[PDB]
Structure formats: C-alpha cells, structure tokens
Amino acid sequence: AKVERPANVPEDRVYEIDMYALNGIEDGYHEAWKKVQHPGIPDLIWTPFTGGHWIATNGDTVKEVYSDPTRFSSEVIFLPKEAGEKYQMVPTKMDPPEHTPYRKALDKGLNLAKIRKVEDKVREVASSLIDSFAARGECDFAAEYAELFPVHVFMALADLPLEDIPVLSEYARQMTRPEGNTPEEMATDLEAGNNGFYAYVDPIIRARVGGDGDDLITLMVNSEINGERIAHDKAQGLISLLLLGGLDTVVNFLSFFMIHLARHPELVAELRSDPLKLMRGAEEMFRRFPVVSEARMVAKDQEYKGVFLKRGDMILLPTALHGLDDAANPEPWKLDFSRRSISHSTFGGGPHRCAGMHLARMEVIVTLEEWLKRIPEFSFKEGETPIYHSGIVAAVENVPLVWP
Ligand code: HEM
Ligand SMILES: CC1(C)[C@@H]2CC[C@@]1(C)C(=O)C2
C-alpha cells in the first residue's frame, strides 16, 4: 500500500522505508534502523509507505523537530496519520499553551524529587520478581521480569491492590499492543482496553477527590487546570497516559539492555565492580537503546532542510537515529559507561520531553542493582535468538538467560 509522490517531495529524497517492517529487523531493531542511515543520507527523507511521510535521519534533525511545537505540532504524533488523528490522548496531543497545565499535573507524580521517595517500593518490585527465578539458574527475562515489572510499579505508584494485576495487565495489552486483521478489529481491541481501564479507575478517581494520599490517582484528580479542579474526563486521560507511558517503553527497553549485557560479560564485571559507574551510566544506556519512533505533524507551511513542507505533512522521529548517530556520539555502538557527552533524544525533547524520565532512570538503575546482587554473571541461552519488531515502540521478546 504505497502513496503517490507529492509535488513537495524531491525524487532524490524518496526512500522505500516501512517503519513497521524495516529490512533486516530480525538482526536487531537498532541494527535495522542504523542500516537505513547510510553515509550522506539527507537530513530529511520521504517514504510512500504508511500514508506517505518524511523521516528525520540524524540527531541534529530529530532534536530540532522535537523542540519546536510552533513548526512541528503534536496534533498528530503517530503514523499512519489517519490512525494518529483518530487516537489522541491527554496531553500528548496538545501544543503549548494548552499542554502546560496538564504537564504540570503530570509533574506532581513524576518529578525528580517525588521519584526519590518511591525508590524503596520500586526496589521491592525488582527484588521480588528477581527472587522468583534467581534460584532456578534460568528465566525468560522478557516474560518473567520485563513484561511484569512496569505493571507492578504502576500498582505501587497508583496505590492499587496487587490482586488487580491480571485485569490491569489485560487492559494494558489491549491499550499498548492492539491486535486485528481489520483496522476495525484493531479498533475493537483498543476500545476493550481503553474503556475497560476507564471503568476500572472511575470509582477510585471519585473516592480519591479531596483525598490525602500521594499516589498517582489522587495527585492527578485534585490537580487544577486554569484555576479550577481538573475535569473528570481529563483526569481519566492523565491516569491512562500514566499507565501507558510507563509500560511498553520500559518492557522493551529493559530487554534490549539485558540482551546486550548477557552478550558482554566484561561490561557486567565492570558494573559489578563499580556501583557508582552503574548508577551514573543509566544515561548511556538510554542513548544506546532508544525505542520510540513517533511523529510530529508539520504545523504550517515552511521551508526545512532544503524542502517545502506542507501543513499536515508528517515527520517520523526515529530516536534510534540520534543515540546511534556517530555525528552526535563517536563510536556509537559501544556501551561506554565513561562516555563523556551522552547525546540523545530517547525521551523526546521540547515541552513534551518524557515526564516519566526520572522514574525510567530509577527503574533501570534499581533493576540492574537488584539483578546483580542475585545474578552476578549470566548469558544468553545458546541456540536462541530474540524476536524483534519495529513500530511506534520497538518490541523485543524471547530473552532466555542462563546463570550458574
Ligand atoms: C525507557 C523508558 C521511557 C522512554 C524511552 C520514554 C519515551 C518517551 C517519549 C519519547 C516521550 C515524548 C512523547 C512526545 O513528545 O510526543 C514520552 C512522554 C511521556 N512519558 Fe515516557 N518514556 C519512558 C518511560 C516512562 C515512564 C516510566 C513513564 C511513567 C509513567 C512515562 C510517562 C510519560 C508521559 C506521561 C509522557 C507525556 C509527557 C507530555 O506530553 O508532556 N514514560 N516518553
Ligand atoms: C508510546 C508513545 C508514542 C505514546 C505517546 C507518547 C509515547 C512515548 C507514550 O508515552 C505513549
């Protein structure tokens, strides 16, 4: 399903790239994106796949598109456009100034200082999951840690009974990874999850208004937007985005770095010997394993990167192409915990820059600490290979790990 080349796209910028099926995906998500970014590739290219869209191809251009809501709007942030148009969320769809009060509400539950207080609960999630299989000498990391860890953290931050994990996990799967052989069946799957989650938190929102708790739900529902308490449905959208933001990004991120560490025993030893360098190299991991490739909509007609972009045009942002850009970071493939200038867009940029980034950093550091306390050496099961997918959030599964 290819679209005709528009008059604003120069023929010499056309690349046949399908963001949902990159060539060579089966050798690695990051590898597949990097093989797109050949030497001398224009800053902005264009593909007829996925409705037809531009693609930012380096760190400089990814950074720039993220930073400027005036020129590149969040009105549509994913591809294809007709799906992204149809599936907006609060406040990822807003530009400033509308966005601002909603981000302020988000920041109440996610700021650096608030996240510090939550470390004990996160650590306890990490240690319990790990304690399940540490004695076994083997596990599927994706299935037995990565897929479970985020939902458990959410329960703790949102103050929700742990026995609701099964129903919330079901809704999570449907909301983050819809299935369907028609876009209609896919639409059904998404609705199941979105409305199911809505029904689930609805009585908790109501019970928590005027409440004294410092969980995520009470913090969102008692936020003020423009001088008055946040609308019921807006608080619902926030709480939903809080579940979502912290799920698929982390599930997959965790596996990508555990895979690499399985295959790099000498880095594992390094981190084991130096827990200050462990703690301080979360940032290097974020650079090396980006997972998001969402989009911006061109907000108005304009010249950019030597082309004329039309209002309504879409620009795909492969965050892999900033972290792994050797113009941005010399020798980018090396996971280097002493790296001096760690340049990346793994959490976006501009006003929407991941509100969850302090939590992300803490989840990663704590996972790595708890893991190494119990499993100081490990590797990838012989004869096995991960399975990769490309899309809005990179997917990896099948991560059999083994240890003495
Ligand atoms: C590896 C971990 C993570 C990655 C790579 C990641 C990535 C991103 C990116 C690229 C954005 C910007 C979206 C845009 O501008 O359109 C974002 C936004 C957001 N993330 Fe994260 N995220 C991660 C973890 C988390 C966690 C743990 C949470 C906690 C729930 C979270 C919650 C959010 C929220 C609420 C936003 C929207 C902020 C806004 O629009 O102002 N994320 N994330
Ligand atoms: C995965 C997303 C594209 C979607 C909107 C922003 C993003 C990073 C999320 O937090 C959910």
Residue type, position 296, single letter = R
| Residues β-bridged to residue 54 | 46, 315
Q: Report which DSSP code applies to 4.
A: P
Residue type, position 175, single letter = M
Collapse the DSSP code of 213 into the 3-class scheme (helix H, G, I; strand E, B; otherwise coil) and give the result: coil
Q: Just give the CATH number of 1-404.
A: 1.10.630.10
Task: Pick the closest to residue 33 from 331, 399, 316, 352 (CA basis).
Answer: 316
DSSP β-ladder status, 53-56 and 314-316: parallel
Q: Report which DSSP code applies to 182.
A: S
Query: CB–CB of 278/378 below 8 Å?
Result: no
Please tell me the distance between residue 238's alpha carbon and the centre of ligand 2 in angstroms.
12
Residue corresponding to tokens 């319990």: 128
Cα 243 vs. chain centroid, distance in angstroms?
Answer: 12
**What's the half-sphere exposure (Cβ side, CA atoms, 13 Å) at 69?**
17
DSSP β-ladder status, 395-397 and 387-389: antiparallel
Query: CB–CB of 322/62 below 8 Å?
Result: yes
Q: Is the peptide bond before 6 cis (omega within 30 degrees of 0)?
A: no
Q: Report which DSSP code applies to 210.
A: T
Q: Which residues line ligand 2 (CB under 6 A)?
A: 92, 244-245, 249, 292, 294, 392-393
Distances from the Cα of 222 to the Cαs of 106, 204, 230, 299, in angstroms? 12, 13, 7, 33
Output the DSSP codes for 127-151.
HHHHHHHGGGTEEEHIIIIITTHHH
15 annotated among ligand-binding-site residues: no
260 annotated among ligand-binding-site residues: no
Domain ranges (residues) in the chain? 1-404
Query: CB–CB of 393/248 below 8 Å?
Result: yes
Please tell me the distance between residue 359's alpha carbon and the centre of ligand 1 in angstroms.
10
Q: Kindly state the tokens that stand for 158.
A: 């949102």
CA 304/CA 319 separation, integer angstroms: 19
Among all ligands shown, which has an atom nearest to the Cα of 285?
1
Distances from the Cα of 378 to the Cαs of 136, 263, 352, 374, in angstroms? 12, 9, 37, 11
Query: What residues contact residue 26 under an 8 Å CB cut-off, 6+ apart?
Result: 387, 388
CA 392/CA 404 separation, integer angstroms: 37
DSSP β-ladder status, 400-402 and 138-140: antiparallel
CA 253/CA 251 separation, integer angstroms: 6
Among all ligands shown, which has an atom nearest to the Cα of 358?
1
Output the DSSP codes for 27-50.
G-HHHHHHHHS-TT--SEEEESST
CA 365/CA 338 separation, integer angstroms: 16
CA 29/CA 394 separation, integer angstroms: 7
389 backbone dihedrals φ, ψ, rounded to 5°: -135, 145
Query: CB–CB of 221/233 below 8 Å?
Result: no
Output the DSSP codes for 303-356.
EETTEEEPTT-EEE--THHHHT-TTTSSSTTS--TT-S-----TT--GGGS-TT
Q: How far apart, in Å, do the first and last CA atoms of the chain sit?
A: 50
Query: CB–CB of 43/328 below 8 Å?
Result: no
Collapse the DSSP code of 379 into the 3-class scheme (helix H, G, I; strand E, B; otherwise coil) and give the result: strand
Q: Which residues line ligand 1 (CB under 6 A)?
A: 74, 77, 91-92, 103, 106, 241-242, 245-246, 249-250, 253, 291-292, 294, 346-348, 352, 354-356, 359-360
Report the atom number in ligand 2 closest to the C-alpha of 292: 8
Q: Report which DSSP code applies to 198.
A: H
Residue type, position 26, single letter = E
